[PDB]
Structure 1
Amino acid sequence: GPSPNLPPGFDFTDPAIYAERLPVAEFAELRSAAPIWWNGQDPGKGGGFHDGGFWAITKLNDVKEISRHSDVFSSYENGVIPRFKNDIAREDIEVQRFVMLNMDAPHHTRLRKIISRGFTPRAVGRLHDELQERAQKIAAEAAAAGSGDFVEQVSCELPLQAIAGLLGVPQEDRGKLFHWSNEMTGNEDPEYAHIDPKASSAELIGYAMKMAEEKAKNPADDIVTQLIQADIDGEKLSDDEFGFFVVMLAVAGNETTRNSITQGMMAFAEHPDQWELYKKVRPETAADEIVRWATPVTAFQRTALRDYELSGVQIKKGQRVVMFYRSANFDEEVFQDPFTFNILRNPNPHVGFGGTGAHYCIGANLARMTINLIFNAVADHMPDLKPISAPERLRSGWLNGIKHWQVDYTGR
C-alpha cells in the first residue's frame, strides 16, 4: 500500500524527537500503514550502528514474536540499546555484552538461572516494609517543601533505595551508589553532557567486587550471598560477574522506574477522574497502566541470526529489528481504547517490561511494588498536588525520560 505519511528521513530513534515529544501520531501511522517498516539511517546518523537502518516493529504481537524467538533474534550481536552517540566506538558497544541483558543462550541461560536467586518473590517481598516506610517519608518530606521538582523530590529516591536494599548496600554507601547509577544514562542530553558512564561503570565494578569479597566472608541475608555461593554444580557468580550484575541493576533499577512514577503522575494530572478513583480505591492495577502509559523503555533491538519471515516481511540475516514498545503498548488490536488512561485495565498485557521470553524483565514485580508504594504515599500526603509548568523531556533515542517537572504539592 501507500508509504506512511512521515517526514522524509524520519528516524524513530532520533533523540531530538524525544527531547521534545513522544512521536505518538507517527507510531500510529506506522501501525495503520506499514506496521513493519524499514527505518533508513543516513551515513553517520545510526546512533552507533552503521548498517543503513533497521526494521521498525510497531505491533505488539510482532514484538512478542521477536521476544519469544531469541534463537533467531539476538541480543548479543549488537546489544539491545538501539541508539548511542553517533560517534560511539564499536568497542564501547561490545563491552555491554558483559551484562546478561546483552547475552544470548547459553551464556545468558546460566547467568539468568543464577541471578533468579536474587529476584525470588520472597527476596523482593522482604523489601516491602522498608520501601513502604521510605515511600511515606519521601512524600511527607516533599509535601513539607510546599512545591518543587516532582522528579527529584518524589520520583528519584525510592527506585534507588530498592536497589540498595536488594543488594544490602550500607546506608553510608548509598550516596555514592546513587551517584554511580545516575552517571550511566542520558549522556546525549546537554544537561548530562559531562557524565562519564564508562568511568562510573568501572568504579561500580570495583565497589561491587569488594562487596562480593566481603559478603563471602560474612553472609548477610540480601541476594548477594545467594549469588556468590556455589550450588551443588559449583554454579555461582564470579566476583567480576557480580560486578557486572550490579552495573546492570544500578542502571536498570533507576531511571525506568523513576520515569514511570513521573509519567504516572503526569497521567493523573491529565485525568482527574482516574486520580480521584486512585485515591479512593488505591488499585494496584494502576502500576501496570502506569508502566503501559509511561513505556519507560521506548525501544530495544535485536539482530537476526538468520533470514526470518515476520508478519509477511522478509527479515534478512544481520538486520536489526527495533521493538517499539511505545507503539506496541497502544496497539488497537490488543487494547480496548489504548489512548484511555484506565487504572483498572485488566488484563493489561503491555510489553513495557518487554515481551515474554528469555530476557523478560526480572525486576518487573519490584518495579510494580515501588510504583504502588510511592503512589499510595503521594495520595496519603499530597492528594491535591497540581503541576506548575510543563515537564522537561530527556534527549534520548530509546529512553522516555522526564528530567524535571515543577509541581505545587499543596495545590493552592
Structure 2
Amino acid sequence: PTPNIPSDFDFLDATLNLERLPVEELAELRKSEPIHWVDVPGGTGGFGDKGYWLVTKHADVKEVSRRSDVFGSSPDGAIPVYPQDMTREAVDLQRAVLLNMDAPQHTRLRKIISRGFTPRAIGRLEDELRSRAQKIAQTAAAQGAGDFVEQVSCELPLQAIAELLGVPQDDRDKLFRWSNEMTAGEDPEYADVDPAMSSFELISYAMKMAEERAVNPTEDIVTKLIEADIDGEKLSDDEFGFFVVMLAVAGNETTRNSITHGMIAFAQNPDQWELYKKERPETAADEIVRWATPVSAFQRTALEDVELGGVQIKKGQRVVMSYRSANFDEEVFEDPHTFNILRSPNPHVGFGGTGAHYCIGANLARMTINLIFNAIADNMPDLKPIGAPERLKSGWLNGIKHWQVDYTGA
C-alpha cells in the first residue's frame, strides 16, 4: 500500500466520480503501486465482498484482458461497482448477456454474433447514417442554442443500432425509450425509470423480430444471426433477445458520451477543432475515444490463485481494469495529456484490451463518431459552450447528462 493513497479510498465511488475522475490518484498508483488493493470493509455494493484489486498500468490491463482463462467475466460480471441497495442476485444474472459470459458459451455466441459486425454489414449503413447525422446537426443548428447532449450526441448512436437491426421506423421511438431507460441505476434525475421492465419488453420485441425474420428473411443482420452457418450454428430466439438487450446498453451511452467529451475536448482545444474542420483526419475518432474513455473501468474475477505484476491474487478476488489510467500511461503514450487528433500510433484500451471480450462494435462506433463530427463541422462549425457540462452520477461510466451550447457561436 502506497503512502500517497489510502486503501479505503474508493476509485469507483459514484459520488466521487460525479465530481471528477480520480485522474491524479490513478497517476499516483502507476508510479508507486500499479496493482493496488482497495479496502471496502463494510462490503461492496452488489458483490458483498470486502474490496477489489485495481490495475492501473497499460501493460497489466492488456494482460488481464488477454488471460480470460484465469480472469473470468461471469462470476461477478464486467461492471465493477454498484450502489449499496444492489443485491447479490442482480449481480449474478448479468451473466445472461454476452459481456458477462465465459467459455464455452461465450466462445460460441461471440463467433455467431461477429457475423453482424463485418466491414460489409457496417459499411452498408454509412449512407443512411450520414443522411441522419446531417439532419441531426441541421435541426440542432436551427434551434440556435440548446442541450448538446440531447440535441446532438444522443440520437445517432441509437439510430445506428436501429439501422443495424433493421428496426422499422414506427418502432424506433419505443426502442429508443427502452434503451435509454436501461442507462440508469444511480443518478437521481433518472430515478423514475424502470430498466428491468424495459429490458423485459426489449427482449420480447427482439424475440418476435427473430420469429418474423425466420419466415420473412431480410438483408439486415438479424437474418444473418438466426440462420445456420455451414456447421448449423445459429442464435435461438431468446439468445437473439439477450443479444439485442446487450446492444441497447453497449452501443448507446458509450458512443453518446464519446461524442460529448469529444466536442468538449474540441472546445478546450480550438487549435485541434480548426485542424479537424479543415482536414477531417481518420485518426480523430480514436483520439476522441481515448480522451473520453467512456468506460472508465471493467473488471474480471480470478478463477484461481494467480500472480500478476508480482502481486498474489487469490481466487474469487475481483480485478478491476482502469481503462482511464491505462489510456494515459506515460510509458505507452507520448504526451498523454495533450489532445491530438493526429495521434499515431494510438494503442488505447478504450474499447478494451485485446482479448475474448474486445468491443465487437468498435468500428461501428468509429463510423458514428466520424459521421456526427463531420456533420457538426459542416452545419455548426462555430459552436461554443454556454454552460458547464453536468456529469452523470456513475462509478464506472464517464457520462455527461447535459451541456448547454450556442450552435451559431454568436
TM-score (norm 2): 0.98
Q: Which moved more, 1:327-336 or 1:77-86?
A: 77-86
Contact 1:75 / 1:102 at 8 angstroms: preserved in 2? yes
Please tell me the root mean square deviation across aligned C-alpha atoms, in Å.
1.0
**1:389-400 pair list within 5 angstroms:** 389-400=387-398
Q: Check if 1:15 corresponds to 2:22.
A: no
Q: 1:303 aligns to what SS in structure 2?
A: strand
**1:99-114 pair list within 5 angstroms:** 99-114=97-112
2:267 to 259, 266, 269: 269
Unaligned runs of 5+ in 1: none
- Whole-angstrom CA distance in 2 between matches of 1:144 and 1:363: 32
- How far is the alpha carbon of 1:194 from its aligned partner? 1.8
Contact 2:203 / 2:242 at 8 angstroms: preserved in 1? yes
Amino acid aligned to 1:109 = T
- How far is the alpha carbon of 1:7 from its aligned partner? 5.8
- How far is the alpha carbon of 1:4 from its aligned partner? 4.3
**1:334-345 pair list within 5 angstroms:** 334-345=332-343
- Whole-angstrom CA distance in 1 between matches of 2:375 and 2:76: 41
Contact 1:47 / 1:82 at 8 angstroms: preserved in 2? no
Deviations 1:48-73 (A, max 9, x none): 11221111100111000000000000
Amino acid aligned to 1:69 = R
Q: 2:19 aligns to what SS in structure 1?
A: coil
Unaligned runs of 5+ in 2: none
Deviations 1:31-55 (A, max 9, x none): 11111100111314x1211221111
Q: Which moved more, 1:104-113 or 1:86-95?
A: 86-95
1:402 to 372, 389, 400: 400
Q: 2:405 aligns to what SS in structure 1?
A: strand
**1:314-329 pair list within 5 angstroms:** 314-329=312-327
- Whole-angstrom CA distance in 2 between matches of 1:3 and 1:235: 50
1:222 to 217, 220, 223: 220
Q: 1:39 aligns to what SS in structure 2?
A: strand
TM-score (norm 1): 0.98
Q: 2:387 aligns to what SS in structure 1?
A: coil
Q: Which moved more, 1:13-22 or 1:371-380?
A: 13-22
Amino acid aligned to 1:256 = T
Q: Which moved more, 1:94-103 or 1:83-92?
A: 83-92
Could you say which residue in structure 2 is the equivalent of 1:116? 114
Contact 2:327 / 2:350 at 8 angstroms: preserved in 1? yes
Q: 2:52 aligns to what SS in structure 1?
A: strand
Contact 1:4 / 1:30 at 8 angstroms: preserved in 2? no
Could you say which residue in structure 2 is the equivalent of 1:383? 381
Fraction of identical pairs, as percent: 77
- Whole-angstrom CA distance in 2 between matches of 1:250 and 1:336: 35
**1:154-169 pair list within 5 angstroms:** 154-169=152-167
Aligned residues: 410
- Whole-angstrom CA distance in 2 between matches of 1:197 and 1:47: 18
Contact 1:186 / 1:395 at 8 angstroms: preserved in 2? no
Could you say which residue in structure 2 is the equivalent of 1:59? 57
2:354 to 350, 353, 356: 356
Contact 1:187 / 1:194 at 8 angstroms: preserved in 2? no
Contact 2:7 / 2:39 at 8 angstroms: preserved in 1? no
